[PDB]
């Protein structure tokens, strides 16, 4: 809660999104392990893209945030929404068993 | 009227009488046979502690973080329902 | 199970007594020699509530009577009115 310190979180994520979205698309690595492959004038080394994938996993994981929030809501509001049929130490207490037993009472037939 | 408050006071006082009588009867039944009431205490206090500690992982900032889903196979309670909940179409 | 905003949460936002009591009771349920040392020690405490309970009961026997008195003073009204 406390939407004073909720905006101060949601203004640091826009920082990171508008800092990652100003990187050049022609970004590439040069590791110290391409010397063992003997790359010619035109040979297409196989470790050129170990930073541009990492600079898109962050940029697309920081846009799929309010999708995993909506999946976590559907998870928690269907695991905690039962809470008395799966957890063993709650469906064995006196009061929970008495309440579940007492909701199932069929109404009395007059005559 | 004053009669309502007077009857309310008599009701409150009878409830205090019930409280004192139950606190008597506990120590009397512990005085007669103490073994199978101390075993009852050690069982039921543990069970009620587990019942009160059945709700601590459903807070605001305990669910917005990641220390429920990842690495909590020690807990095992949720993230094991996902084989069931997808098969029911809820998602 | 992806920590996506966990780092920003850690940026912006940076008992024993009853367990010892339970160990004491688990030691009391081993040797018989303490059980009588419990029992009479409990048996006086029950008496401590009996001296409680009558001090409640002798209050109700007070607090009923005025209400009963509040029903005599109305009924002696009718001792006139019906005879009227």
């Amino acid at each position: 809660g406390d939407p004073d310190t909720e905006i101060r979180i949601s203004a640091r994520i826009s920082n990171r999104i508008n800092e990652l979205e100003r990187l050049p698309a022609n970004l590439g690595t040069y590791s110290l392990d391409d010397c063992l492959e003997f790359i010619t004038k035109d040979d297409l080394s196989s470790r050129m893209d170990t930073f541009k994938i990492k600079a898109l996993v962050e940029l697309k994981s920081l846009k799929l945030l309010t999708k995993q929030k909506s999946i976590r809501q559907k998870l928690i509001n269907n695991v905690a929404s039962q809470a008395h049929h799966n957890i063993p130490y709650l469906r064995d207490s006196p009061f929970t068993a008495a309440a579940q037993r007492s909701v199932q009472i069929r109404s009395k037939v007059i005559v | 009227a004053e009669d309502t408050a007077k009857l309310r006071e008599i009701t409150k006082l009878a409830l205090q009488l019930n409280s004192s009588a139950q606190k008597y009867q506990f120590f009397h039944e512990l005085s007669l046979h103490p073994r199978e009431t101390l075993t009852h205490y050690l069982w039921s206090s543990k069970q009620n502690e587990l019942v009160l500690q059945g709700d601590q992982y459903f807070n605001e900032d305990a669910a917005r973080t990641s220390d429920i889903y990842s690495n909590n196979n020690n807990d095992r309670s949720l993230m094991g329902n996902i084989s069931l909940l997808y098969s029911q179409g809820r998602l | 199970s992806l920590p996506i905003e966990d780092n920003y949460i850690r940026e912006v936002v940076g008992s024993k007594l009853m367990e010892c009591v339970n160990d004491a009771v688990q030691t009391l349920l081993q040797g018989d020699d303490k059980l009588g040392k419990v029992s009479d020690k409990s048996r006086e405490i029950s008496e401590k509530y009996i001296e409680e309970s009558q001090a409640i009961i002798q209050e109700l026997v007070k607090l009923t009577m005025e209400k009963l008195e509040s029903k005599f003073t109305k009924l002696c009204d009718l001792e006139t009115q019906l005879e009227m």
Partner: peptide
């Protein structure tokens, strides 16, 4: 323990902004 990786090599410097790599500089 699982942690989101602190990708420092992508991160542009804040205080100086003249000691970055030449690709992250404009």
């Amino acid at each position: 323990k699982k942690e989101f990786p602190v990708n420092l090599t992508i991160k542009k410097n804040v205080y100086d902004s003249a000691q970055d790599f030449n690709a992250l500089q404009d």
